[PDB]
Subunit: 151 residues, 6 copies
């Protein structure tokens, strides 16, 4: 009954390279419902919170600097298995392993410029939704094609 | 030689979700030849015959009712290995497993609303072609690009 | 006036050149409803009835020859002002006078190879629909997006 | 000149019909800079402020109704003559007068379901921007391709 | 008449902004025949020859500097009225005046960064083809779809 | 490393079937840099050198015949791991094994009409580049988006 949500952020390279519309189209055409969306330059402290699990990695400062180097598009999407399916659609974390047809497979080359983030679990998703969105920014509506996407 | 043919049907949800053009385009761009095509609401009797091998399964009444709940686009496509290759282009029957780049992978979420049918064997293909089309609704012509698609 | 219908045929060149999906997509995305569709080689006799107002013109033989030279995709589309708007979408009769973004403007060059026909008036649409389709081939269903296309 | 901004809102019909990505791609590909974006159900109050110059009009309570009937994507885009040019890109107010190639020409049919709003003048834009966005929601960054879009 | 040629050049901003595939696709989809294509950084001397008519204009040095500032894609396309029709497809010289659906209307903003050049007459085309291409770089072949593009 | 180059040739079938723009777009959008491009009918003598290793095979004559039967688009592309990644983008040598989302998977059917060639190694690539291009045909410039594709 198809209420799972995931957090997806188009990274500053995705914005800079003019991919926002293309990426959103992929999620819309698949049948997922856009729940929330905002555009911002994320603060350093916010990004450190987001990537708290990577804080002791040598690449972490560079990741935070890159993730703050331009605006991101932050989104929440709803649908059956949106967490795992969203991850499939994005492609492997490293664009190198990413297959053609996927977002990273189609559009990027290096892991440190891999255009998009998607939650890696339901638990991570709910943390990330809380971090990036106030509850009232999550919009409840019913898609007109819902009964053709779901039995 | 006379090339292999497959039966492709765009299901009520694929029509409803506005994917008819997108789907046909993928077959045309691959180099397959459209042999036949019609748009209809398949009667429950016609669907009972299409799914006759499933007449004793518990889901059969619901399947037939669903498949009768909107029009389908019924098609025959020709080409080398079109049955197997068409099936790959459609993706796995469960969209949860279908890869980005495939029809079901790109455009749908749940197996009960999986937008499209393709024949699963040459046997099944000929069965399906004979059921859904009169032999005179199958058009013979040579694609202008045939000698660039086939040696 | 939202039940108006037009007759659209993809001409033999439009089929040969692989434009069936593209064409259908433009009608779907606009919000029009597909009512009927089939794929056939129209007989010379059928085409003489379609072009009956022109039977005494010198270009008649060549017109019927062209329209019979391969299969066409015959369609009925429904919506508010679909006749006039559909015509605008197609472009002008001469592709050279058809603007970029129209079907003829984007996809063909010469008036005698102008890929697509659309009815020129409601009167001609009603005539053409009857000629090419039996009433039982016209499917009645409601678009899930209807209430977002129409007030 | 180059720092002009306009207010673009994708109406509830454009969201419902899966056109958000499509619309953003058009502005991206043109060379305009996205300054702000958010997704929200606009309150009846907010909408009455936005349409305050029609309070005393027949069509007001149902307009405010439609515009509150689903979420909208509110955006601020920057560029030379973006107000006038954005308007041309959207098409005419009535989709029936909107040329193929424009957003309304391509995607919708009826004036009460015309998918998108754009500012009608520079003064209107600065009014709309200040109504719909906090100043801190407007992001200042430089497009990597700026020097290839502008002398 | 179907053997007319035109010179089309993607300017350095069109290459930088990743529009080469898109542009070529528009010409291919129209039915025109690619006759010659090369990628180069045009020399200052070459450019001064190309713009010989404007050699006494104040802006000529800056124009040559721009046009030398990155590579261009130089092309020759063949077809009926391709000089005039190519021009239409590109849009007006000033992207402010170019309509949605045209190359310039869809993809650029400022006249100085107007992404593409096409010949303005048969005489200009022949001059430009002689300047930019060696005779042996124009390739003779017949499109497989020629009889479907031309009567 | 980031300055690796590969050789990509769009075979005569790829040109004939109007896939030049589509192919180039896939490389552009990935973030690879176009270094060199020309369009020619490769002579039997040139193709004999290109396939020199296969000169004693029974299929060699028909291979050369095919590859000389129309023009090709020869390209050099640059970027990190572009040889291997380019290969993945193209799909397997046999279109039957090529996944949807790949060039051969999406656009062709038979191994002997498989639309495109890419280098199979760095060694091969440099050999092919020397054969197909003069060194002065390889253009040095920096992509405006370089710093958003690469760390």
């Amino acid at each position: 009954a198809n209420l799972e949500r995931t957090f997806i952020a188009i990274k500053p390279d995705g914005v800079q390279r003019g991919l926002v519309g293309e990426i959103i189209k992929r999620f819309e055409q698949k049948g997922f419902r856009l729940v929330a969306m905002k555009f911002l330059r994320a603060s350093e402290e916010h990004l450190k919170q987001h990537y708290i699990d990577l804080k002791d990695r040598p690449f972490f400062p560079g990741l935070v600097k890159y993730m703050n180097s331009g605006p991101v598009v932050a989104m929440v999407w709803e649908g059956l298995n949106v967490v795992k399916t969203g991850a499939v659609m994005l492609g492997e974390t490293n664009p190198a392993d990413s297959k053609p047809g996927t977002i990273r497979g189609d559009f990027c080359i290096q892991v440190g410029r891999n255009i998009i983030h998607g939650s890696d679990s339901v638990k991570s998703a709910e943390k990330e939704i809380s971090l990036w969105f106030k509850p009232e920014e999550l919009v409840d509506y019913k898609s007109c094609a819902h009964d053709w996407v779901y039995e």
